[PDB]
Amino acid sequence: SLMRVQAHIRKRMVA
Amino acid sequence: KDMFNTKSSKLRIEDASHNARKLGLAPSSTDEKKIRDLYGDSLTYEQYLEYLTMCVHDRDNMEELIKMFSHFDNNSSGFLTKNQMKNILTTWGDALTEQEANDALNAFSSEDRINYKLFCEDILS
């Protein structure tokens, strides 16, 4: 759940 | 060349994950462990496509994403401060660095008081 948020934040890092 | 054949020799899980993000998906350490536990440290093309399917997470949505933040919002007001969200994001789960967390929070808002539902809605796109 928090891990889902963190996964999308890392997704957002790459352009 | 495609994202898989650029780095193939088999492709390292860690690189598969990066490709997944460039394709707009969001792998966690749980998915990496799942794909590792049956195919090892490196994936064939076919294994790598299973991994991308694994990373679709079609149950991702705002209400699932906010659950941990809601726990910290006692009166269910809807907001948390940047620093609150930073501590949460950098202590639990697949913890971000402070910098990574702050960068996400600063990109979304210039105010300290953050609507975490809207922040979770925004990071999904």
d(CA B10, CA B42): 6
Of A9, A11, A15, Cβ closest to residue B96: A9
Burial B78-110 (b: 16+ CB within 10 A, else e): ebbebebbbebbbeebbebeeebbbebbeebee
| Deposited resolution, Å | 2.3
Domain limits, chain B: 1-59, 60-124
Domain B1-59 of CATH type 3.40.50.10490: no
Q: Nearest-CA distance from B77 to chain A in Å?
A: 19
Helix runs in chain B, H state only: 3-7, 13-22, 29-39, 45-54, 62-65, 67-72, 82-91, 98-108, 116-123
CB B42 within 8 A of CB B10: yes
- Mutation target to probe the A interface, by most A beta carbons within 10 A, among B22, B72, B86, B94 is B94
Q: Please give the structure tokens belonging to residue B121.
A: 């809605």
Domains B1-59 and B60-124 equal at CATH topology level: yes
CATH topology (fold) of B60-124: Recoverin; domain 1 (1.10.238)
Smallest CA–CA distance from A11 into chain B, residue: B21
Of A6, A12, A14, Cβ closest to residue B94: A6
* Cβ separation B27–A5 shorter than 8 A: no
